[PDB]
Amino acid sequence: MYYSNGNYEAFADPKKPAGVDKKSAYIIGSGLAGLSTAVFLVRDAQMKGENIHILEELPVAGFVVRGGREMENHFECLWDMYRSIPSLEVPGASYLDEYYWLDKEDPNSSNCRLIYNRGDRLPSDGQYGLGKCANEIVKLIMTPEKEIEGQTIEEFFSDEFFKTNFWTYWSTMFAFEKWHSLAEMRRYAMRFIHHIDGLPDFTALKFNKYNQYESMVKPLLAYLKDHGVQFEYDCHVKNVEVDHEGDSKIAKKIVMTQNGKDKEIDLTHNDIVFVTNGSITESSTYGDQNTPAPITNAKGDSWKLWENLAKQDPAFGHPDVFCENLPERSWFVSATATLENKKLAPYFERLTKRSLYDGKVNTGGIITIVDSNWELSFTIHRQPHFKSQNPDQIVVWIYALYSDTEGNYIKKRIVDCTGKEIAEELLYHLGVPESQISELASEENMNTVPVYMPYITSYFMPRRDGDRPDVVPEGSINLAFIGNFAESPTRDTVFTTEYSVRTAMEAVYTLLNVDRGVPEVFDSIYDIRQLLRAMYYMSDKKKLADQDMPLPEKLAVKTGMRKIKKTWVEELLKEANLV
Amino acid sequence: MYYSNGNYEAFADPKKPAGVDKKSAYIIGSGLAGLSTAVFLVRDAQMKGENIHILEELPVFVVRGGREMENHFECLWDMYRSIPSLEVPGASYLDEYYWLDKEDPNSSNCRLIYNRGDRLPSDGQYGLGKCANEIVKLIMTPEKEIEGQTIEEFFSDEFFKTNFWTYWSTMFAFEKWHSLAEMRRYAMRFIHHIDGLPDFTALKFNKYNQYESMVKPLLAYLKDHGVQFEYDCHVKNVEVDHEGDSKIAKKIVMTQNGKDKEIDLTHNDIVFVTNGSITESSTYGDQNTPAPITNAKGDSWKLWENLAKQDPAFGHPDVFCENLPERSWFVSATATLENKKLAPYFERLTKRSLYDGKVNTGGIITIVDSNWELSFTIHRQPHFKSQNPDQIVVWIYALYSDTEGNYIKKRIVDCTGKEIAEELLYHLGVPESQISELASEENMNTVPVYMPYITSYFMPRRDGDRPDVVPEGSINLAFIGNFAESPTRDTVFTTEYSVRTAMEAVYTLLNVDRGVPEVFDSIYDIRQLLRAMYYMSDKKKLADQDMPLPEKLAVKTGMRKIKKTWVEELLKEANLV
Ligand SMILES: [K+]
Ligand SMILES: [K+]
Ligand code: NA
């Protein structure tokens, strides 16, 4: 397998690799990584549809389970796949095309990113406000990853840094807690450096037409049905068994249980197994307008499988780190709130300076209430978010970064609230008069459903070498792990769909010997223009000479700019507006 | 119009732009730029095919010859993925090219020879020494600061004796009196290939000659979409108006079939002009006849002079087509081997059989002690589908045309095809007694061609000498080709440049809402800069590379400061530490 960039490798179709007609696929998990694996198998590997079996775990507005995240232009792998996938809303076009045109017609941006004081836009919204703390960020990048193994963000950054607007933007938009992986933070900093100009106003973000299920899953599924892939419902997989022959490792056996009966499968090498290991959606619970949701550390199929696998060889990772010992402080709860009327529309609309009812982008991503004890953020997508919605309905997404804090108005934790209470704390923070809050929040006017999720923060748990198992373990023969808990050999970032697609690609290309480049992670961090541009925007648009840095550094910079006068480097600096 | 990079914009299909049915296309020139312009109009602008008219200059073999490419011809690959192959049914041309490149990868086992068949001992070395710094000095020098400047005005005499200059000049056809700015552009553009210049591993080739592999699938695609080719067309001028600051094309005055003709045009008729030519006025010779020397300006150049007359922004053809030195490259010849008598000489050079259908010379071989700066190449065979199984076609070029050969005491421009072949056979180490018979028609047939403007793209230039692809205020007129000025830093004497001008022109004029890929950004990639300093110096660690003393001091100080950092990791990756 090899990595590449540029149009030549992107537009190129791979040759059918040797002996793929004698081979089959077992995809355990209908998670994005698994399905992606299947799509690549059909398209690039040219394995046959009737030979792909995706083993699902389930039998066949306000839907948290269907909700999904944003993307950006530089999800290279994901855009490769989706340019191969037929759209459902605009027949005859690829999903990528639908997405691309929608983004052009209804471009994402936020008119209000940070609020406080019960509904006032934060005066410094739009500013990073880093000061010398910017240098800290640079230092993090200058620090090799192996050197920060297991280390935490809180362990690296100053208190002053954590008071910056930059940290409010970063933590809330990416769900980075202070006790999370410093190495992963650093990866985000390098990876999305090209969007430093668009994080505060979210112009960097792009969104699907609808919730993740309608926009991202249904077109894939239709594509697969058209290609005769095999769907298995109500299946519950229990383990996979592996042998060691010299330095080689082979998957010999899979044990499991389906429908109402137990089953087993010995394996040919020509049967290929991909495990979408781990989950952040498992054990999700529901409440409603008048009911809350319950605390857990319960495990499940993915986690258990992964422990057995770790038992068999060290190379399968050390899983507990992701599903065990999550703080009460952790983000756990996410809720949906459906507005049945236009009674609460003005509060949001006053924030966004846009109408909720034109079908266009609204909050353009999350709005964070900075003086909220829960660190409450909320977002209203382009509507309808679900096609079921009636013309007057609006759907609002609510999340708390802190789950160990008493709210400002509802003195209970987010975890102890019904939908009505979360709605109530939000209404208080929107500047709804407290006398009106009870009638405005109730079902006649507002219908709110919460969900609790033990594992939503699991991806970002700090890690150590060998903690995450290589997508192809050294010596593996028909077994691969795919998804956001697998270790791609790239510097790519988890809690992204792009990572899932990348793992599927690397796994399929490696195992099935597909002779085509896998795109490297987009190389913005190595593009000097991007480095300069980032220094410009991170500093809130200050010329290099005016930026906050220690005095010897400032002098050194003055000397450097003196030396490079009338040079290509000076031109580069001019281009970045650093002089 | 906007520039972009990455897969998102690459894989995205543009919307049909507004009002593309009230507009028409007249493409002057059926060369790669024109055909590409037509392809983008059909595919992206979605102009209807019968509304596209390509005015060809020709009625219904060196001239067929074409250059190599590389992976980062971003626009060209964007085009050829849409074009069906003819050799590989059901696949795109890009697919054919890609698979071919994979099964028969290009490389050279012998780049430089001398002493009549001996491989140069330093083959594979750039051998730059301290001269390497000059190259850096050039990169670090803003283009505006070297406007109009010449290559020999910048570089030390020691630099010109380096192997690097031999490789560079012979592979790219850079003469010393050529554009320094263009050289700088080549250095930045192809920096990602510094690891693969001596052995030509950077190069990729079509299965066949340019007409067969590059042009024919295009023609089939275009006719298939019902584009209209109008033949025997000789455009003499295009008349344009000045309204306020605006420029508009009114009329094309042409002669077709010996008759003066005209087409007056609305603002909505769109005309693409391939200004200038490097192939025009080419003359032919054969085994027993030299090609006639000429200074004639054909249709293309006259058209460009007239256009320059009409508007100041329309460029200055005279800087490209006038006063070219006699030393300039002029002659290229094809030598068809009718049998296997001379085969061992080429085979001893390439360490490969000439008859396995696979790559041979893998690009040009330069004979360093030849007075002509004689280079020759043998592509993967057959190069023309016409060839019979015993035939092998050899391409011969001389960078110097004002010098007497070593065996044939004439300048190449005064030689028969047989004489050129004789000089080549001499340099291959054929015994002097055998040379006349071996060069003779029974064994070799060599056809020379004299091309007056083959070096014109590289003539030194100044801002405005080349007209902007869409000059400011134009509403229906665009210039395309390797004489047009793309607003990018892209490199001419490349097919990729032709494709780029076509894409930029169509996207700008017809308001196509999709990114045009920027020139591939290897020059801005730190991994590539580091890699370049590594390979350029013939694999020396940064401290060991030959450097002036203050500069060296700066480097030791720098390396000291960045010790144990991510930057040190990058330097490690580049093998600079
Ligand atoms: K790029
Ligand atoms: K060969
Ligand atoms: Na769709």
Catalogue all structural domains in chain B, each as residue range(s) with its CATH number. 2-105+202-322+452-524 (3.50.50.60), 106-121+323-450 (3.30.9.80), 122-201+525-577 (no CATH)
Query: Nearest-CA residue of chain B relative to A97?
Result: B12
CA-to-CA separations, B338 to A354, B12, B362, B387, B421, in angstroms, rounded: 78, 50, 21, 10, 13
* CB-based contacts of B213, cutoff 8 Å, min separation 6: B66, B93, B206, B207
Compute the distance between CA of residue A237 and CA of residue A26 in angstroms, rounded to an integer. 11
The H or E element that residue B242 is part of is strand B233-243
Compute the distance between CA of residue B170 and CA of residue B198 in angstroms, rounded to an integer. 11
Place of tokens 């930057």: B567
Contact B142 A566 (CB under 8 A): yes
Place of tokens 């281009």: A575
Q: Which of B2, B3, B4, B7 to mutate to test the interface with A (most CBs of A within 10 A)?
A: B7
Compute the distance between CA of residue B522 and CA of residue B528 in angstroms, rounded to an integer. 6
Q: Looking at the CA of A216, which ligand is closest?
A: 3
Query: Nearest-CA residue of chain A relative to B9?
Result: A73
Query: Nearest-CA residue of chain A relative to B140?
Result: A568
| Structure resolution, Å | 2.2
Contact list in A for residue B566 (CB cut-off 8 A) is 141-144
Contact A12 B517 (CB under 8 A): no
Contact list in A for residue B565 (CB cut-off 8 A) is 142-144
Torsion on CA atoms A504, A508, A511, A517, rounded to nearest 10:
-110
Cα(A88) to centroid(ligand 3), Å? 3
Q: Which two tokens stand for residue B90?
A: 């059901």
A277: amino acid identity, one letter:
N
Compute the distance between CA of residue B494 and CA of residue B186 in angstroms, rounded to an integer. 10
Asked if the peptide bond before residue B382 counts as cis, ω within 30 degrees of 0, the response is: yes
Compute the distance between CA of residue B311 and CA of residue A206 in angstroms, rounded to an integer. 44
Q: Which two tokens stand for residue A59?
A: 């039998």
Phi, psi of B63 (to 5 degrees): -60, -25
Phi, psi of A232 (to 5 degrees): -110, 125
- Residue A376, SS3? strand
Contact A8 B72 (CB under 8 A): yes
Contact A11 B81 (CB under 8 A): yes
- Residue A194, SS3? helix
Cα(B524) to centroid(ligand 1), Å? 10
User: Using the 8-state DSSP alphabet, how is residue B83 labeled?
Assistant: S
| Minimum-distance CB partner of B520 among A6, A80, A519 | A6
Contact A144 B99 (CB under 8 A): no
Q: Which of these, B187, B495, B197, B192, lies nearest to B362 by C-alpha position?
A: B197
Q: Which two tokens stand for residue B491?
A: 């490199």
Compute the distance between CA of residue B112 and CA of residue B127 in angstroms, rounded to an integer. 13
Compute the distance between CA of residue A367 and CA of residue A112 in angstroms, rounded to an integer. 7
Check A169, A188, A223, A428 and give the catalytic one.
A188
Torsion on CA atoms B127, B129, B131, B135, rounded to nearest 10:
70
**From its phi and psi, is residue A35 left (phi > 0), alpha (psi between -120 and 50) or beta?**
alpha
> Taking a C-beta distance cutoff of 8 angstroms, is the pair B410, B384 a contact?
no
Q: Which residues of chain B are at the A interface, by a Cβ-Cβ cutoff of 8 Å?
A: 6-13, 15, 71-75, 77-78, 81, 91-92, 94-95, 98-99, 102, 139-142, 145, 513, 517, 520-521, 524-527, 564-567, 569
Compute the distance between CA of residue A534 and CA of residue A525 in angstroms, rounded to an integer. 10
Place of tokens 């007075």: B371
Phi, psi of B89 (to 5 degrees): -60, 140
* CB-based contacts of B103, cutoff 8 Å, min separation 6: none
The residue length of chain B stands at 577
The CA-CA-CA angle for residues A98, B224, B56, to 5°, reads 115
Torsion on CA atoms B4, B8, B13, B19, rounded to nearest 10:
-40
Compute the distance between CA of residue A88 and CA of residue A91 in angstroms, rounded to an integer. 6
Question: What is the experimental method?
Answer: X-ray
Q: Which of these, B514, B518, B508, lies nearest to B37 by C-alpha position?
A: B508
A28 forms beta bridges with A55, A275
User: Residue B347: how many CB atoms within 10 A of its CB?
Assistant: 15
Q: Looking at the CA of B379, which ligand is closest?
A: 2
